[PDB]
Amino acid sequence: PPPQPRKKRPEDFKFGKILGEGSFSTVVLARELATSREYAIKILEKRHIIKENKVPYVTRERDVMSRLDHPFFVKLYFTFQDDEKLYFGLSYAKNGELLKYIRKIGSFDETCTRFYTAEIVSALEYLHGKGIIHRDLKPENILLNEDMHIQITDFGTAKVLSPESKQARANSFVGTAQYVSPELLTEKSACKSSDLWALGCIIYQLVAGLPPFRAGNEGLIFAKIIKLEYDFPEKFFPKARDLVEKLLVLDATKRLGCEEMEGYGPLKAHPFFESVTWENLHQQTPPKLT
Ligand SMILES: CCCCC(=O)N(Cc1ccc(-c2ccccc2-c2nn[nH]n2)cc1)[C@H](C(=O)O)C(C)C
Ligand SMILES: CCCCC(=O)N(Cc1ccc(-c2ccccc2-c2nn[nH]n2)cc1)[C@H](C(=O)O)C(C)C
Ligand SMILES: CCCCC(=O)N(Cc1ccc(-c2ccccc2-c2nn[nH]n2)cc1)[C@H](C(=O)O)C(C)C
Structure with a gap:
């Protein structure tokens, strides 16, 4: 496959405060240990989105955001998953x-x-x-x-x-x-x-x-x-x-x-x-x- 950085994992980050709660997602401030960079990580539980028929919205969000490359949009830097959750690494818009x-x-x-x-x-x-x-x-x-x-x-x-x-x-x-x-x-x-x-x-x-x-x-x-x-x-x-x-x-x-x-x-x-x-x-x- 094309050269890219190693896929990230939850243990790559120290998680801090919750920045927002949605009906089917939660956004947490996280610091990447290896760089000290701060990301807003949007986290979704697989069981919940499966049950509430939210997977198409989640896949749509990833597909559309991955196509954007312009300064006036929140950036999607990476995604990953574990056995229970999906994770989007987003830019943190500090002023809300x-x-x-x-x-x-x-x-x-x-x-x-x-x-x-x-x-x-x-x-x-x-x-x-x-x-x-x-x-x-x-x-x-x-x-x-x-x-x-x-x-x-x-x-x-x-x-x-x-x-x-x-x-x-x-x-x-x-x-x-x-x-x-x-x-x-x-x-x-x-x-x-x-x-x-x-x-x-x-x-x-x-x-x-x-x-x-x-x-x-x-x-x-x-x-x-x-x-x-x-x-x-x-x-x-x-x-x-x-x-x-x-x-x-x-x-x-x-x-x-x-x-x-x-x-x-x-x-x-x-x-x-x-x-x-x-x-x-x-x-x-x-x-x-x-
Ligand atoms: C990793 C999260 C769960 C993903 C997964 O692996 N699954 C659920 C699912 C649901 C919806 C879609 C989907 C995505 C985009 C567009 C339409 C749809 C869709 N699919 N059905 N209606 N809309 C994909 C997967 C299995 C499957 O359903 O394959 C189940 C068995 C757990
Ligand atoms: C009506 C489509 C139903 C689903 C399906 O069947 N598809 C799309 C898809 C998209 C996304 C996922 C997904 C979403 C969240 C997390 C992991 C996954 C995933 N993606 N792969 N494994 N898990 C699953 C399926 C096939 C494929 O993906 O090819 C189509 C294109 C034939
Ligand atoms: C089940 C993992 C193998 C499937 C796979 O490899 N792909 C489809 C894909 C990728 C990412 C997601 C996803 C969606 C929301 C949140 C996190 C993730 C995620 N899951 N793992 N990392 N990010 C869903 C489907 C690649 C792609 O379409 O990009 C192909 C082209 C190689």
Whole structure:
């Protein structure tokens, strides 16, 4: 086989605190003894994922993450298993979820909204260029590294579209109610443009402090999405409002940035992004949130 480092094993690490608990996974900070490097190790119990029919999501996460090579994504460095567990060695995003910052500060100023929006747009341009739909983009899945650059995660519900068939639509029903696109609800398929709908909701949330479609329960949220039933608060940055209006469009072929709208060029050219230097965002110093 191709030359590669020795496969790792649990005894190669000292495990420390739990960083997160999921319904079928747990993430633990670990130090690799031989290097002193720190990883976030996602651990899944084989019996549990077998019983709860989660193996396809686990295999999907490994397959999609292994294809990514870009600074705005959590990195999958290695995987291994033992008799009871599967292990993913991921980069550790020390500053946690973007959602945490929205909640603490209430909403972002225009400079920070623009910067973080531009990072997300650049990450989506990369993903869509590889024919990958995220399908569950939301602030909880946009992590922040030590330098406050984004690290998008949660690829177990992502989809690699088939280049051989020029596949544009994916059929699995996945996502989170507040960010799900109208085409997934009504046509039961998603496309790359479904991520641009989620982007619109995220920009709105950064400025307004709440996602645009919101209610106590999921069904009520769905009813608002399909009617495009939302409003802006009064002081919303005007160019950001124009951008959100060009993303939160019911017809998935009419969202700025989608292929039918001639792609990322026109989206990056939107007036909200006038000052952005798109070429090397990950090398730029992020603006301070407070
Ligand atoms: C190492 C974890 C357990 C893996 C394994 O070895 N197994 C379970 C299983 C389940 C689902 C899949 C799967 C993966 C991707 C896409 C679809 C599916 C799937 N498979 N069925 N429905 N969806 C693979 C393995 C055996 C088997 O089922 O082969 C059992 C006997 C323990
Ligand atoms: C409907 C597919 C059902 C499963 C199956 O049958 N497949 C895929 C697969 C993927 C992943 C695993 C897996 C997941 C977690 C941990 C270990 C494993 C694993 N992988 N190998 N052994 N265990 C298992 C099966 C065959 C194969 O893998 O070839 C298809 C492609 C014919
Ligand atoms: C049962 C191990 C032999 C199967 C094997 O070798 N492969 C399939 C594979 C690999 C890794 C996983 C996996 C998924 C989630 C978490 C950990 C692991 C894991 N298990 N062991 N290490 N990582 C599932 C299936 C290779 C590959 O598809 O990459 C082939 C191409 C050589």
